Swiss-Prot record:
Coiled-coil stretches: none
Lineage of producing organism: Eukaryota, Metazoa, Ecdysozoa, Arthropoda, Hexapoda
Chain segments carrying region Interaction with guide RNA: 81-86
Protein encoded by which gene: AGO2
Protein's name according to its UniProt entry: Protein argonaute-2
Organism: Drosophila melanogaster (Fruit fly)
Location of the protein in the cell: Nucleus; Cytoplasm, Cytoplasmic ribonucleoprotein granule
Regions that span the bilayer: none
Full-protein interval shown: 602 to 717 of 1214
Subunit structure: Interacts with Fmr1, Dcr-1 and vig to form the RNA-induced silencing complex (RISC), a ribonucleoprotein (RNP) complex involved in translation regulation, other components of the complex are RpL5, RpL11 and Rm62. As part of the RISC complex, interacts with Tudor-SN. Interacts with Taf11.
Amino acid sequence: AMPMIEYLERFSLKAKINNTTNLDYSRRFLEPFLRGINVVYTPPQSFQSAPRVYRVNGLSRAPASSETFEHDGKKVTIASYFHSRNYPLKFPQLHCLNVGSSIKSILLPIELCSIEE
């Protein structure tokens, strides 16, 4: 598993990667580029889930700092969602990956995604 963040830094930015770097604009322009890819999502062990390969429809219309999602009739934000799940996000203020389907969109920051070499 090659960290998708590593891919972004080396290939997408050609510079330094971080939330302090303008990966936001890279996120928005890479949307069609990632639309139709497969990534291995490495879940924090608080999730108790196995590294799952998700099919990327694309990227979310909003950054994970603003993106709320319905989980059991309750909406929370992905930034706080991972943070309380014992995974402090390094890219919380950036767009989240949209995998799965239109009916149920799995939104996960590309920080936790790895690309299968």
